[model samples]
Target: NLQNIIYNPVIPFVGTIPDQLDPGTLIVIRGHVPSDADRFQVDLQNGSSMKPRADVAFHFNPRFKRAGCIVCNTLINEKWGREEITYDTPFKREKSFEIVIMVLKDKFQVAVNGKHTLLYGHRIGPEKIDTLGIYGKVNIHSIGFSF
Candidate 1:
């Protein structure tokens, strides 16, 4: 029951994740950015809330500001923590990408298109995250969760 996959999700996709996140859990997202895309964000959150805000364990955002860059951060108590910026731009406009997020005891290791990217240390406990949110201008092919 670990491998649950969602295909061709609509933009700004938000869905339920696992009930409990373990150390060996992996989250895989396959998608393509639009040529006119400016940015996109993927979040692992504690709860799904808008007004009061949810605690995001991992906030993965790729922005096409000039060449391109990826920003990783966490949100606690409705405020964003310090950002981890990676300028290693592996994403191209209109090109497909595979993003893998590996959950570890201390951090979440993220890889883009088979290349190792940044890691976001656990700000909120991983077990608390039960929601997956994808936002901004991109076409998501599939999203999968495994252990």
Candidate 2:
């Protein structure tokens, strides 16, 4: 058990989710991004490695605070390396929403708050993983994957 194995506990925010997402299905995860001291990251991984295949990080940016907004970083690791895109906008104070993720053969369509955010193209490397995790000082109410 020492050949390409990843350690456990996984920063405490990593765990498994309900395995019920099919192709072209919509996965909705509704949770609260705490307005505490640090940031938080929600991830989707193969549940094999301790790292996520795709992740969404949300936090308050000091520079963006003056503009009355928070920043969200969307990271995708698909073959060709990793790519991250940041979005700066004020978040809903006491409101939570669902993220519609359309699963595809080669890419996953991610939509946050009803707007099509980005597409994570899959690369031929690691096998498909089935799990969702959250990290950082954030309290997640729930993460449900649906059709």
Candidate 3:
């Protein structure tokens, strides 16, 4: 089986991607939201630096409070760009979710549990993304990079 797949990643995890992403690349993440979870995030970062904090190409965060929303944004030089928030989320507490992020020439299209979620325009070159970071109260079962 020749596949670039990462399975059962631990929380607060940061892993190096096998190859640089491009238009045909797809990022798939399978995870579960804890019953007591407040929020969690998946980040496409340039590196895994902690002190200075790596540049985040895309930040996908989901909040599960008060019929919560999903927030998307970008970070460069440790500074956050404008926030893109979506009030209608297909995720729920104590449930599993499958997030598919499709890379494009100019944007990243995302879907949550088969429902179209949002599109985030590229803030930085996809070639600069080498790290995948997932944090907060999320139990990730698998993550994959496929063409």
Best by TM-score: 3
Of candidates 2 and 1, the better by lDDT: 1
Q: Candidates' TM-scores?
A: 0.94, 0.58, 0.95
How far is each candidate from the true structure, as Cα RMSD in Å? Answer: 1.4, 8.6, 1.5
How many clashing residue pairs, candidate 2?
A: 1
Candidate structures ordered by lDDT, highest first: 3, 1, 2
lDDT of 1 by residue, 11-35 (tens): 7888989557789888989999999
Pitting candidate 1 against candidate 3, the one with the higher TM-score is 3
> How many residue pairs clash in each candidate at the backbone level?
0, 1, 0
Q: After best superposition, candidate 1 residue 144: deviation in angstroms?
A: 0.6
Candidate 3 local distance difference test against the native = 0.90
Worst 10 residues of 1 by lDDT: 1-10
Local distance difference test, each candidate = 0.88, 0.47, 0.90
TM-score of predicted structure 2: 0.58
The residue-by-residue lDDT of candidate 2 on 73-122, one tens digit each, is: 33345332344444543234344544556667666676767777666555
Q: After TM-score superposition, what is the CA distance of residue 65 in candidate 1 from its true location, in Å?
A: 1.8
Question: Which of 1 and 2 is ahead in TM-score?
Answer: 1
